[PDB]
Amino acid sequence: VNYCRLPCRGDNYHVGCGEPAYAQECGQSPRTRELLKEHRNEILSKINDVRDHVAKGSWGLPVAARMKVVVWDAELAGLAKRHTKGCVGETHACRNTERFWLPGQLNFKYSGDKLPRIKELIDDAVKKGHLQKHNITREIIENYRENGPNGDVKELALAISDRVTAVGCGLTTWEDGAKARALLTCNFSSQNTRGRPVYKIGNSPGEKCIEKDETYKNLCSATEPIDPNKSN
Ligand SMILES: CCCCC/C=C\C\C=C/C=C/C=C/C[C@@H](O)CCCC(=O)O
Ligand SMILES: [Pr+3]
């Protein structure tokens, strides 16, 4: 759609409006990086692996009643890509779409002497989020607080939201401060709501799916009619 004509509460500019430009903050060697089919599958795979483990009742975390298999969203991905071109993690830009009224977003910054391959950047972000299982409590799951803590849970808690139905990421790499740098941004179809459950508890995993998936046995299939625009 036309993002310059899709308003949002707060009336902030939309990340998607106008022509794509690289931010000055990107220095003078920025390059946007295409997440190819294998990159999108790896991302989907890791996010669905962990959703399946958690919904199972892993880490004493409660069992999940209706946690869905996630799909890639090209629209979210475009907005993510476009966001990385600003070379900055946090902005007040709007990023809503017609389908996903309040998309969550995660940003993974990298800084080092050398630039790792795209796959290595993704595994870094996967590793970072995975490492928060040492931080996420069932308390957090019953009643989302982001801080907390100690310590950080936002990344992992967003990957296991049962309101989330779709993800889309983008990547820009550049050079500044004598370091190779990268911003990896993932937009999600939904977001965790402060004070509300990350996902709804059950006795059996997926006991509330119309249809459980055949690969991620503890999750609802791709066609589960979850509303990503309602919170828990
Ligand atoms: C672009 C990356 C998006 C990051 C989203 C945030 C967190 C997802 C993080 C980790 C997923 C890890 C999967 C690990 C292996 C799999 O067997 C999961 C179970 C391992 C375990 O139970 O500790
Ligand atoms: Pr292509």
Short mmCIF file of all heavy atoms in Angstrom, two decimals, residues 129-176:
data_model
loop_
_atom_site.label_atom_id
_atom_site.label_comp_id
_atom_site.label_asym_id
_atom_site.label_seq_id
_atom_site.Cartn_x
_atom_site.Cartn_y
_atom_site.Cartn_z
N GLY A 129 19.39 -14.55 21.38
CA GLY A 129 18.05 -14.78 21.88
C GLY A 129 17.93 -16.07 22.68
O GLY A 129 17.28 -16.10 23.72
N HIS A 130 18.54 -17.13 22.16
CA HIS A 130 18.57 -18.44 22.80
C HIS A 130 19.13 -18.34 24.22
O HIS A 130 18.68 -19.03 25.13
CB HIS A 130 19.43 -19.39 21.95
CG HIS A 130 19.39 -20.82 22.38
ND1 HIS A 130 20.54 -21.57 22.57
CD2 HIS A 130 18.36 -21.65 22.66
CE1 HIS A 130 20.21 -22.79 22.95
NE2 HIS A 130 18.89 -22.86 23.01
N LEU A 131 20.12 -17.47 24.40
CA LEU A 131 20.82 -17.32 25.67
C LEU A 131 19.99 -16.61 26.75
O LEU A 131 20.45 -16.45 27.88
CB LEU A 131 22.15 -16.60 25.47
CG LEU A 131 23.43 -17.45 25.39
CD1 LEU A 131 23.81 -17.95 26.77
CD2 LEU A 131 23.29 -18.62 24.42
N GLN A 132 18.78 -16.19 26.40
CA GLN A 132 17.91 -15.51 27.35
C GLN A 132 17.00 -16.49 28.10
O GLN A 132 16.27 -16.11 29.01
CB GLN A 132 17.07 -14.42 26.64
CG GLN A 132 17.90 -13.28 26.04
CD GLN A 132 17.07 -12.30 25.22
OE1 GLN A 132 15.89 -12.54 24.93
NE2 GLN A 132 17.68 -11.19 24.83
N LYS A 133 17.06 -17.77 27.73
CA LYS A 133 16.30 -18.79 28.45
C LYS A 133 16.80 -18.87 29.88
O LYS A 133 16.12 -19.40 30.76
CB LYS A 133 16.40 -20.16 27.76
CG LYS A 133 17.65 -20.94 28.11
CD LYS A 133 17.95 -22.00 27.06
CE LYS A 133 18.30 -23.33 27.72
NZ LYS A 133 19.13 -24.23 26.86
N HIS A 134 18.00 -18.33 30.10
CA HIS A 134 18.61 -18.22 31.43
C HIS A 134 18.11 -16.97 32.15
O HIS A 134 18.59 -16.64 33.23
CB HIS A 134 20.14 -18.16 31.30
CG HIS A 134 20.75 -19.38 30.68
ND1 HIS A 134 21.74 -19.32 29.74
CD2 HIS A 134 20.51 -20.70 30.90
CE1 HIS A 134 22.09 -20.54 29.38
NE2 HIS A 134 21.36 -21.40 30.07
N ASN A 135 17.15 -16.28 31.53
CA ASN A 135 16.62 -15.03 32.06
C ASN A 135 15.10 -15.01 32.09
O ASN A 135 14.49 -14.37 32.95
CB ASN A 135 17.12 -13.84 31.24
CG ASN A 135 18.63 -13.72 31.25
OD1 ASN A 135 19.31 -14.20 32.17
ND2 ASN A 135 19.17 -13.08 30.22
N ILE A 136 14.48 -15.71 31.15
CA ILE A 136 13.02 -15.72 31.06
C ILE A 136 12.36 -16.66 32.09
O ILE A 136 12.60 -17.87 32.09
CB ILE A 136 12.57 -16.03 29.59
CG1 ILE A 136 11.13 -15.58 29.36
CG2 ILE A 136 12.76 -17.49 29.24
CD1 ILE A 136 10.76 -15.58 27.91
N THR A 137 11.54 -16.10 32.98
CA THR A 137 10.82 -16.88 33.99
C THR A 137 9.36 -17.11 33.58
O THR A 137 8.82 -16.38 32.75
CB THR A 137 10.79 -16.15 35.35
OG1 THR A 137 10.08 -14.92 35.21
CG2 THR A 137 12.20 -15.87 35.87
N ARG A 138 8.72 -18.10 34.19
CA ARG A 138 7.29 -18.32 33.95
C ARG A 138 6.50 -17.11 34.42
O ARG A 138 5.38 -16.87 33.95
CB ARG A 138 6.79 -19.59 34.66
CG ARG A 138 5.85 -19.32 35.84
CD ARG A 138 4.95 -20.53 36.12
NE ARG A 138 5.63 -21.79 35.82
CZ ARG A 138 5.03 -22.86 35.30
NH1 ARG A 138 3.73 -22.84 35.05
NH2 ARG A 138 5.74 -23.95 35.04
N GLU A 139 7.08 -16.36 35.35
CA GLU A 139 6.51 -15.11 35.80
C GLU A 139 6.41 -14.12 34.64
O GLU A 139 5.35 -13.55 34.38
CB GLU A 139 7.35 -14.51 36.92
CG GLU A 139 7.21 -15.21 38.27
CD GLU A 139 8.19 -16.36 38.45
OE1 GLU A 139 9.39 -16.17 38.20
OE2 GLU A 139 7.75 -17.46 38.86
N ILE A 140 7.52 -13.94 33.95
CA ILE A 140 7.55 -13.12 32.74
C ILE A 140 6.48 -13.60 31.76
O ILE A 140 5.87 -12.80 31.07
CB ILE A 140 8.91 -13.21 32.03
CG1 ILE A 140 10.02 -12.67 32.93
CG2 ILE A 140 8.86 -12.49 30.70
CD1 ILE A 140 9.87 -11.22 33.27
N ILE A 141 6.28 -14.91 31.69
CA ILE A 141 5.37 -15.49 30.71
C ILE A 141 3.91 -15.22 31.08
O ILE A 141 3.05 -15.11 30.22
CB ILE A 141 5.58 -17.00 30.56
CG1 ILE A 141 6.99 -17.29 30.04
CG2 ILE A 141 4.53 -17.60 29.63
CD1 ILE A 141 7.15 -16.98 28.59
N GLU A 142 3.65 -15.13 32.37
CA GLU A 142 2.29 -14.88 32.84
C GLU A 142 1.99 -13.41 32.71
O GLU A 142 0.86 -13.02 32.44
CB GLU A 142 2.17 -15.30 34.31
CG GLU A 142 2.44 -16.78 34.57
CD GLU A 142 2.76 -17.07 36.03
OE1 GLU A 142 3.10 -16.12 36.77
OE2 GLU A 142 2.70 -18.25 36.43
N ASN A 143 3.03 -12.60 32.88
CA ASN A 143 2.85 -11.17 32.99
C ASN A 143 4.04 -10.44 32.37
O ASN A 143 4.95 -10.00 33.07
CB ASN A 143 2.68 -10.79 34.47
CG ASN A 143 2.23 -9.36 34.66
OD1 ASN A 143 1.08 -9.02 34.36
ND2 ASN A 143 3.13 -8.52 35.15
N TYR A 144 4.03 -10.29 31.05
CA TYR A 144 5.18 -9.73 30.36
C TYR A 144 5.67 -8.42 30.97
O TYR A 144 4.94 -7.42 31.02
CB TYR A 144 4.89 -9.56 28.87
CG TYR A 144 6.10 -9.08 28.09
CD1 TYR A 144 7.16 -9.94 27.80
CD2 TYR A 144 6.19 -7.78 27.64
CE1 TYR A 144 8.27 -9.51 27.10
CE2 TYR A 144 7.31 -7.34 26.93
CZ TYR A 144 8.34 -8.22 26.66
OH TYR A 144 9.44 -7.79 25.97
N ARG A 145 6.90 -8.45 31.46
CA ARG A 145 7.68 -7.24 31.71
C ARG A 145 8.98 -7.43 30.96
O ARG A 145 9.52 -8.54 30.93
CB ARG A 145 7.96 -7.03 33.21
CG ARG A 145 6.73 -6.98 34.11
CD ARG A 145 5.90 -5.70 33.94
NE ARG A 145 4.60 -5.79 34.60
CZ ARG A 145 3.66 -4.85 34.54
NH1 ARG A 145 3.89 -3.74 33.85
NH2 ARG A 145 2.51 -5.01 35.16
N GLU A 146 9.49 -6.35 30.38
CA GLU A 146 10.65 -6.43 29.50
C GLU A 146 11.91 -6.12 30.30
O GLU A 146 12.97 -6.74 30.11
CB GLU A 146 10.47 -5.42 28.38
CG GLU A 146 11.61 -5.32 27.42
CD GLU A 146 11.24 -4.42 26.28
OE1 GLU A 146 10.17 -4.66 25.68
OE2 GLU A 146 12.01 -3.48 25.98
N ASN A 147 11.78 -5.13 31.18
CA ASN A 147 12.68 -4.94 32.30
C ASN A 147 11.77 -4.79 33.51
O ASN A 147 10.91 -3.89 33.53
CB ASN A 147 13.56 -3.70 32.12
CG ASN A 147 14.20 -3.61 30.73
OD1 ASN A 147 15.05 -4.43 30.36
ND2 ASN A 147 13.82 -2.59 29.97
N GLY A 148 11.93 -5.66 34.51
CA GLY A 148 13.00 -6.63 34.53
C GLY A 148 14.22 -5.96 35.12
O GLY A 148 14.19 -4.77 35.39
N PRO A 149 15.31 -6.70 35.33
CA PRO A 149 15.42 -8.14 35.20
C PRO A 149 16.04 -8.74 36.48
O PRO A 149 15.30 -8.72 37.47
CB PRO A 149 16.30 -8.26 33.97
CG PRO A 149 17.09 -6.88 33.91
CD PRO A 149 16.60 -6.07 35.07
N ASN A 150 17.28 -9.24 36.55
CA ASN A 150 18.29 -9.30 35.48
C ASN A 150 18.36 -10.68 34.82
O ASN A 150 18.40 -11.69 35.54
CB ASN A 150 19.66 -8.91 36.04
CG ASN A 150 20.03 -7.47 35.75
OD1 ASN A 150 19.50 -6.55 36.37
ND2 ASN A 150 20.94 -7.27 34.81
N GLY A 151 18.39 -10.76 33.48
CA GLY A 151 18.45 -9.61 32.59
C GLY A 151 17.50 -9.63 31.38
O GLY A 151 16.30 -9.93 31.51
N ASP A 152 18.04 -9.32 30.21
CA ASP A 152 17.25 -9.13 28.98
C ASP A 152 16.46 -10.34 28.50
O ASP A 152 16.98 -11.45 28.44
CB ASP A 152 18.18 -8.68 27.86
CG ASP A 152 18.66 -7.27 28.04
OD1 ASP A 152 18.30 -6.64 29.06
OD2 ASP A 152 19.40 -6.78 27.16
N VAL A 153 15.20 -10.11 28.12
CA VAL A 153 14.35 -11.20 27.62
C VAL A 153 13.55 -10.84 26.36
O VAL A 153 12.92 -11.70 25.76
CB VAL A 153 13.39 -11.73 28.70
CG1 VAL A 153 14.17 -12.41 29.81
CG2 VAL A 153 12.51 -10.61 29.26
N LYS A 154 13.59 -9.56 25.97
CA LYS A 154 12.75 -9.08 24.87
C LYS A 154 12.84 -9.91 23.60
O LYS A 154 11.82 -10.21 22.98
CB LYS A 154 13.08 -7.64 24.52
CG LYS A 154 12.34 -7.17 23.29
CD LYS A 154 12.61 -5.71 23.03
CE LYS A 154 11.94 -5.22 21.77
NZ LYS A 154 11.80 -3.74 21.85
N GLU A 155 14.05 -10.27 23.21
CA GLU A 155 14.25 -10.98 21.95
C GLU A 155 13.59 -12.35 21.99
O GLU A 155 12.79 -12.69 21.11
CB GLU A 155 15.74 -11.09 21.61
CG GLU A 155 16.33 -9.79 21.03
CD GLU A 155 16.45 -8.68 22.06
OE1 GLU A 155 16.44 -8.99 23.26
OE2 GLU A 155 16.54 -7.50 21.66
N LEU A 156 13.91 -13.13 23.01
CA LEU A 156 13.38 -14.48 23.13
C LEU A 156 11.88 -14.46 23.40
O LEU A 156 11.13 -15.28 22.86
CB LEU A 156 14.11 -15.23 24.23
CG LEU A 156 13.56 -16.60 24.66
CD1 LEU A 156 13.44 -17.54 23.48
CD2 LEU A 156 14.47 -17.19 25.72
N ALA A 157 11.44 -13.53 24.25
CA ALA A 157 10.04 -13.44 24.62
C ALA A 157 9.18 -13.07 23.40
O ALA A 157 8.01 -13.43 23.32
CB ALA A 157 9.83 -12.44 25.78
N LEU A 158 9.77 -12.35 22.45
CA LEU A 158 9.03 -12.01 21.25
C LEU A 158 8.90 -13.20 20.30
O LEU A 158 7.84 -13.41 19.72
CB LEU A 158 9.57 -10.75 20.54
CG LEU A 158 8.75 -10.39 19.29
CD1 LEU A 158 7.27 -10.31 19.63
CD2 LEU A 158 9.23 -9.10 18.64
N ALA A 159 9.98 -13.97 20.17
CA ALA A 159 9.97 -15.20 19.36
C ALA A 159 8.97 -16.24 19.86
O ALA A 159 8.47 -17.03 19.06
CB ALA A 159 11.40 -15.83 19.25
N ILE A 160 8.67 -16.25 21.16
CA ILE A 160 7.71 -17.21 21.68
C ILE A 160 6.32 -16.64 22.04
O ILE A 160 5.58 -17.25 22.82
CB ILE A 160 8.27 -18.05 22.86
CG1 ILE A 160 8.45 -17.20 24.12
CG2 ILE A 160 9.57 -18.70 22.47
CD1 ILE A 160 9.01 -17.99 25.30
N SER A 161 5.97 -15.50 21.46
CA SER A 161 4.63 -14.97 21.68
C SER A 161 3.66 -15.79 20.88
O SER A 161 3.88 -16.06 19.72
CB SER A 161 4.53 -13.51 21.25
OG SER A 161 3.18 -13.09 21.28
N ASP A 162 2.55 -16.19 21.50
CA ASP A 162 1.54 -16.95 20.77
C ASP A 162 0.59 -16.07 19.96
O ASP A 162 -0.29 -16.59 19.26
CB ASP A 162 0.80 -17.93 21.70
CG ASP A 162 -0.12 -17.24 22.68
OD1 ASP A 162 -0.09 -16.00 22.81
OD2 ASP A 162 -0.88 -17.98 23.33
N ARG A 163 0.77 -14.75 20.03
CA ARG A 163 0.05 -13.84 19.14
C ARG A 163 0.82 -13.66 17.84
O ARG A 163 0.26 -13.23 16.82
CB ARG A 163 -0.18 -12.45 19.78
CG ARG A 163 -0.73 -12.43 21.20
CD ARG A 163 -1.94 -13.32 21.35
NE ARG A 163 -2.94 -13.08 20.32
CZ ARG A 163 -4.03 -13.81 20.16
NH1 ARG A 163 -4.25 -14.84 20.97
NH2 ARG A 163 -4.90 -13.53 19.19
N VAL A 164 2.11 -13.99 17.87
CA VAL A 164 2.95 -13.83 16.69
C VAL A 164 2.64 -14.92 15.67
O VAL A 164 2.48 -16.08 16.04
CB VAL A 164 4.47 -13.81 17.03
CG1 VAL A 164 5.32 -14.16 15.81
CG2 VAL A 164 4.85 -12.45 17.57
N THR A 165 2.55 -14.53 14.41
CA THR A 165 2.15 -15.43 13.33
C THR A 165 3.08 -15.33 12.14
O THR A 165 3.07 -16.19 11.27
CB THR A 165 0.69 -15.12 12.87
OG1 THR A 165 0.63 -13.79 12.33
CG2 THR A 165 -0.27 -15.20 14.03
N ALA A 166 3.89 -14.28 12.09
CA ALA A 166 4.74 -14.01 10.93
C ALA A 166 5.94 -13.13 11.27
O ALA A 166 5.85 -12.26 12.13
CB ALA A 166 3.92 -13.36 9.81
N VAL A 167 7.05 -13.36 10.58
CA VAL A 167 8.26 -12.56 10.77
C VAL A 167 8.84 -12.13 9.43
O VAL A 167 8.58 -12.77 8.41
CB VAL A 167 9.33 -13.34 11.57
CG1 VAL A 167 9.78 -14.54 10.79
CG2 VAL A 167 10.52 -12.44 11.91
N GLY A 168 9.62 -11.05 9.43
CA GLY A 168 10.31 -10.61 8.23
C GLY A 168 11.50 -9.76 8.59
O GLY A 168 11.35 -8.72 9.22
N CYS A 169 12.70 -10.18 8.18
CA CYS A 169 13.92 -9.46 8.54
C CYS A 169 14.64 -8.83 7.35
O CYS A 169 14.40 -9.17 6.19
CB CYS A 169 14.89 -10.37 9.28
SG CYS A 169 14.10 -11.45 10.46
N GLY A 170 15.53 -7.90 7.69
CA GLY A 170 16.34 -7.15 6.75
C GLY A 170 17.72 -6.92 7.33
O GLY A 170 17.94 -7.01 8.55
N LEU A 171 18.68 -6.60 6.45
CA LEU A 171 20.06 -6.50 6.89
C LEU A 171 20.86 -5.45 6.12
O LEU A 171 20.89 -5.45 4.89
CB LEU A 171 20.77 -7.86 6.78
CG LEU A 171 22.26 -7.85 7.08
CD1 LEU A 171 22.50 -7.37 8.50
CD2 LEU A 171 22.89 -9.24 6.87
N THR A 172 21.51 -4.57 6.87
CA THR A 172 22.44 -3.63 6.27
C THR A 172 23.80 -3.71 6.98
O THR A 172 23.87 -3.75 8.21
CB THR A 172 21.87 -2.20 6.30
OG1 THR A 172 20.66 -2.16 5.52
CG2 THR A 172 22.87 -1.20 5.74
N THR A 173 24.88 -3.73 6.21
CA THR A 173 26.21 -3.74 6.81
C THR A 173 27.00 -2.54 6.33
O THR A 173 26.78 -2.06 5.22
CB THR A 173 27.01 -5.04 6.51
OG1 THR A 173 27.35 -5.10 5.12
CG2 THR A 173 26.19 -6.26 6.89
N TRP A 174 27.90 -2.05 7.16
CA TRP A 174 28.68 -0.89 6.80
C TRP A 174 29.98 -0.82 7.57
O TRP A 174 30.39 -1.80 8.21
CB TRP A 174 27.89 0.40 7.03
CG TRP A 174 27.61 0.74 8.49
CD1 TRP A 174 28.28 1.65 9.25
CD2 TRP A 174 26.57 0.20 9.33
NE1 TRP A 174 27.73 1.71 10.51
CE2 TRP A 174 26.69 0.83 10.59
CE3 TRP A 174 25.57 -0.76 9.14
CZ2 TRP A 174 25.83 0.52 11.65
CZ3 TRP A 174 24.73 -1.05 10.21
CH2 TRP A 174 24.86 -0.41 11.44
N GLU A 175 30.60 0.35 7.52
CA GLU A 175 31.90 0.58 8.14
C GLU A 175 31.93 1.93 8.79
O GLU A 175 31.60 2.95 8.17
CB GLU A 175 32.99 0.53 7.09
CG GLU A 175 33.31 -0.85 6.67
CD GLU A 175 34.72 -1.21 7.02
OE1 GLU A 175 35.46 -0.33 7.53
OE2 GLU A 175 35.10 -2.37 6.79
N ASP A 176 32.34 1.95 10.05
CA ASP A 176 32.53 3.21 10.76
C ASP A 176 33.26 2.93 12.06
O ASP A 176 33.21 1.80 12.57
CB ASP A 176 31.19 3.89 11.03
CG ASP A 176 31.35 5.33 11.50
OD1 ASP A 176 32.16 6.06 10.90
OD2 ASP A 176 30.67 5.73 12.47
#
